[PDB]
Amino acid sequence: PPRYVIGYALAPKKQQSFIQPSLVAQAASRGMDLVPVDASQPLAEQGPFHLLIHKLYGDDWRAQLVAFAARHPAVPIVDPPHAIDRLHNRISMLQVVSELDHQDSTFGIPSQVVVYDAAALADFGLLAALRFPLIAKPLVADGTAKSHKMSLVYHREGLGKLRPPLVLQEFVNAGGVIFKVYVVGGHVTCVKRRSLPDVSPEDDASAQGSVSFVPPAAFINQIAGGLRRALGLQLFNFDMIRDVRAGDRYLVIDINYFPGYAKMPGYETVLTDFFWEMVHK
Amino acid sequence: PPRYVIGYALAPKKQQSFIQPSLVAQAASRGMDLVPVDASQPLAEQGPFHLLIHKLYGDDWRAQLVAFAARHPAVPIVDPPHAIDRLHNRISMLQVVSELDHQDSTFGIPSQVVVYDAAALADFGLLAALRFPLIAKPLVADGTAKSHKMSLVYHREGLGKLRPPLVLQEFVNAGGVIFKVYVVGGHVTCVKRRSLPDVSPEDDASAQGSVSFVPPAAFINQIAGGLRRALGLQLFNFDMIRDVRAGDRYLVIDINYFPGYAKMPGYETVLTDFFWEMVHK
Ligand SMILES: O=P(O)(O)O[C@H]1[C@H](OP(=O)(O)O)[C@@H](OP(=O)(O)O)[C@H](OP(=O)(O)O)[C@@H](OP(=O)(O)O)[C@H]1OP(=O)(O)O
Ligand SMILES: O=P(O)(O)O[C@H]1[C@H](OP(=O)(O)O)[C@@H](OP(=O)(O)O)[C@H](OP(=O)(O)O)[C@@H](OP(=O)(O)O)[C@H]1OP(=O)(O)O
Ligand SMILES: [Cl-]
Ligand SMILES: [Cl-]
């Protein structure tokens, strides 16, 4: 009964959250050995590996994965950098998701306003017919975590202070609720987040968060399945809203590589079954 | 005095316009031999080449250029497919152009509205505060020429009939004038195109086109230079408007790979000097 080496190249803070003793031991009990990748040596001098999982960015890290992928074509990489690239530009990302087909629920993409420079952020006429609150997000991101963050914006003044180029999306047809859907291979958890039309400094109104494992479950798996086929990613979460006008249409508003799976209890079982699948194809 | 082989992989219609006897003879008089690439054989069995120019798309054509670039690292390709990729998504394209710096003129990028689906094209509230006429353009293109075309749209009804995903840009601050700037290496020609706020069926008002080789010439070369450094393309034209509110700010609204250089008289001299530079680096 052979053993599988699962290499992992993660920042220390992501190691602390995701590589917990309970995951290491569960995986070792099933013949899978989680081995940290030395950031101080080339990847080519390390291993061998039966599977490689990472959350690092840079041209050096990318070169290594290209080298590695050429030297070792059979060894799965989670995820390949070419596939994480698809998230780099918010507008290209949502385009790749739009090329899905179709069920008693429909799923669409909300329209986006792209503002490239400071000047336009002042004097672009259309901005003055937007409804608040708005989701703002930098246009390009991969790397620094702040680029991955999506802001709720309550005032025109507060927009005027964001750093362009950014993407603007209306949030008013959502009923104040975002569904964050964690995916590993085939699914995991949904966080329901409720936001409000008034900020909190403006009026003392409340926001709330709950967890489950709320939109139809057969539909969420249909979506999650298509995102994975289209993006070629195995580890992502995706933000979605109900269009509460009809009340049966859903919209994908965001996608994030390798989110915080350790926040969900029982993540160790889900990720260990995933590693098992990946090293047996 | 050795001879340089300039291979060319062009569609027949593009061969008829661009590969004229006058260019073939001018280049042969200077020791450069224009050789057609056989579309019926692999590129790897043809040549050898000192320079390769093309306007073909597809995964087969791309494989060949990747093969070729690995076998022949010193041989310049005009242009490399990785660089033509930068034009594929209108929003990523304008992002790459936005990462230029800065002169008595400024240059910016107009804001864009991205509409991904039929539903949103009907019911997205912001569309109703846009000013007409609008430039509409498909979001993704490279390949079929219709995707490369940018439409002037005069009515809301006429928008309602476009195929999503598309990008919308306001055209009202331009004074009804677009400057098309042809670039080869370092510059070439400007077409001044004048469009109007009423379509022509609506009112019998006129549009006009003139040519020159109107914005400052030192500035046009500053822009053209930066586009080339940033996109890594040697053969493009770029559309630009004056913001006629101030009257000294210009905006880049579009970029097209390898346009119709043969429409400009004296193109043969410009392209032959270009081939000379390319085979001597
Ligand atoms: O800003 P980031 O470093 O990308 O961190 C985010 C962010 O955390 P902050 O509250 O510190 O900004 C999210 O919080 P929200 O702003 O979306 O509420 C959090 O989501 P949760 O609060 O729901 O834990 C998310 O975690 P996830 O990746 O699980 O979506 C986490 O991202 P990282 O922990 O991956 O960096
Ligand atoms: O639609 P495309 O095949 O991309 O053809 C276009 C288009 O021609 P149509 O008039 O047939 O649509 C342009 O015309 P406009 O619509 O912009 O007026 C023309 O520009 P000119 O009329 O100014 O010749 C342009 O040529 P260029 O590439 O020189 O910008 C030419 O593109 P191709 O000849 O490259 O296909
Ligand atoms: Cl985690
Ligand atoms: Cl031509």
Residue pair B268/B249 in contact by the 8 Å Cβ criterion: no
What is the DSSP secondary structure assignment for residue A75, as one 8-state letter?
S
Query: Is some CB atom of chain B closer than 8 A to the CB atom of A70?
Result: no
Q: What's A170's domain CATH number?
A: 3.30.470.20
Tell me if chain A has a CB within 8 Å of the CB of B252: no
Rounded distance between C-alpha atoms, residue B58 and residue B143, angstroms = 8
C-beta separation of B79 from B65 below 8 A = no
The stretches of A203-266 forming alpha helices (DSSP H) are 217-231
Spatial CA neighbour of B182 closest among B242, B277, B118, B263 = B263
Dihedral pair phi/psi, residue A199, rounded to 5°: -65, -55
Tell me the structure's resolution in angstroms, rounded to a single decimal.
2.6
Helix (H, G, I), strand (E, B) or coil at A46: coil
SS (H, E, C) B103-142: CCCEEECCCEEEECCHHHHHHCHHHHHCCCCEEEEECECC
Count other C-beta atoms under 10 Å from residue B247's C-beta: 8
- Put simply, the chain B residues between 116 and 155 with a CB less than 8 A from any chain A CB are 116-117, 119-120, 124-131, 139-140
Q: For residues B109 and B94, what is the distance between their CA atoms, to the nearest angstrom? A: 7
- Which residue, among A169, A168, A98, has the nearest Cα to B164 in the 3D structure? A98
B185 burial level (CB within 10 Å; 0-12, 13-18, 19+):
middle
The experimental method, as deposited, was X-ray
DSSP assignments along chain B, one per residue: ---EEEEEEE-HHHHHHHS-HHHHHHHHTTTEEEEEPPTTS-GGGS---SEEEEE--SHHHHHHHHHHHHH-TTS-EES-HHHHHTTSBHHHHHHHHHT-----SEEE---EEEE-SHHHHHH-GGGGGPPSSEEEEESB-SSSHHHH--EEE--HHHHTTS-SSEEEEE-TTSTTEEEEEEEESS-EEEEEEE--SS-SSSS----EEEEE----HHHHHHHHHHHHHHH--SEEEEEEEEETTTSSEEEEEEEEES--GGGSTTHHHHHHHHHHHHTT-
Domain coverage including residue B126: 90-263
**Beta strand B188-194 pairing with B208-212:** antiparallel
Site of tokens 């840009």: B169
Q: What single letter denotes the amino acid at residue A171?
A: F
Mutate to test the interface with B, among A93, A94, A105, A111 (most CBs of B within 10 A): A111
Whether residue B114 lies within 8 A of chain A, CB to CB, comes out as: yes
